[PDB]
Design a protein around this ligand. Structure first.
Ligand code: NI
Ligand code: NI
Ligand code: NI
Ligand code: NI
Lengths: 135, 135, 135, 135
């Protein structure tokens, strides 16, 4: 009704995956835009390739971008979103064969807010997205 | 209301642009999917960005993927769609500084249904998408 | 607002052309379906191709199914539609070299509602579609 | 001779499977068409493919749509059809490794008559069609 679940996903070709941000998160993201700006960009029915609005809980559903590798594609999310989805997200990681600590391989704002800032972290943690087929 | 206006847009990174297909078009598209298959994929919430549903009329609107430089990004559409939108599409082409014959630089099913089939045509005709910044 | 909701086209291979029906025509068409049932299909889940929703005035557009050979392909329309488009249609027929008479070569509900009923009439009247390349 | 007039199949890409309806069932189906409207299409000036007429017992035949993955693709049928084939269908389900309760994962008119109505049910029951390759 009011949009309190609202999140925005964006493709990050250089990380071979997707970032997600949320309405409550003030911070810059690796897409070069805040949630606020992103929302402004798509906000008059102006669909833009590589960006989609989603409900924050769609992220932890079985069908989540399933045929393109599901939650394994997530390479960046705000720490606030990790915390919020944590228990579901972990249980989902496990179901997907990604292990319980997959969430810790995912970059966040404490790591960086640009691709150049987060990519070495993704690399050093061995994030599965980096070796999956092209996004 | 029945989705009479429905079209689907997909990113084609190698053409540095987008393709568009429609319900009434049976044919294979350069995305490697028919409209029907595309729709199947995103009606199930199976869809990642790079594929999305759009209204036929959004295509000729001033705000059409404005952040990405608008209709200049369209590198493939069914001929039936060109014919249908023709007058408005031509007007929009002119307003956008693409010239009246822009629609003829755009590939369609008579040219091919794969990237390898259409890319030479796009090159031949000097399609503006090719020299734009990355889609 | 393209007029999408007001008419539906369908191919009739045996007539080597197309039929059109409209929202105000409740009666049977050579497609074996009414406008309403055709609409139900479009709004349905099959994603069947080949049934374009159009505005009536698209029929008298310059590029009207130009990719398929234009108005010469129309083999059936409701009489109410003939009346609606008459003057424009005749004008278009002249421009296309089909003669002013063309509209009268086109079948309608007074002729029949099936291919078996309308095809001998098309043949009688020397409808140009019959001799054109396959659709 | 083969019972071709008993039932009609149609594809539902967003359920990644097929529906079946019968000459005994007048209810609306997820195809947006009733049996009788489907039959009308068949007979029918358009020659549109994809709507095969079948005998009810074809459904429980060994090679039933084997090319498309067999009975695992069925996502909707009238309850009257489930009852009619029940024992054979269950036997077939077991043989195919789908379990005895497969028939219960399949939607029917008591679940809904549109894709939007039946898709969440399919999802919650874990219908195998959803996990299969694109239909
Ligand atoms: Ni509609
Ligand atoms: Ni419209
Ligand atoms: Ni038979
Ligand atoms: Ni029959």
């Amino acid at each position: 009704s009011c949009g309190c679940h609202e999140a925005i996903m964006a493709i990050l070709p250089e990380c071979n995956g997707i970032m997600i941000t949320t309405r409550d998160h003030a911070g810059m993201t690796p897409s070069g835009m805040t949630f606020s700006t992103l929302a402004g960009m798509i906000g008059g029915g102006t669909q833009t390739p590589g960006f989609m609005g989603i409900g924050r809980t769609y992220i932890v559903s079985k069908k989540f971008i399933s045929a393109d590798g599901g939650i394994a594609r997530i390479v960046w999310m705000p720490k606030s979103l990790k915390d919020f989805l944590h228990d579901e997200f972990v249980r989902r990681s496990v179901e997907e064969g990604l292990g319980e600590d997959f969430i810790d391989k995912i970059a966040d704002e404490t790591i960086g807010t640009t691709v150049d800032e987060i990519l070495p972290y993704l690399e050093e943690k061995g994030h599965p997205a980096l070796t999956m087929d092209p996004i």
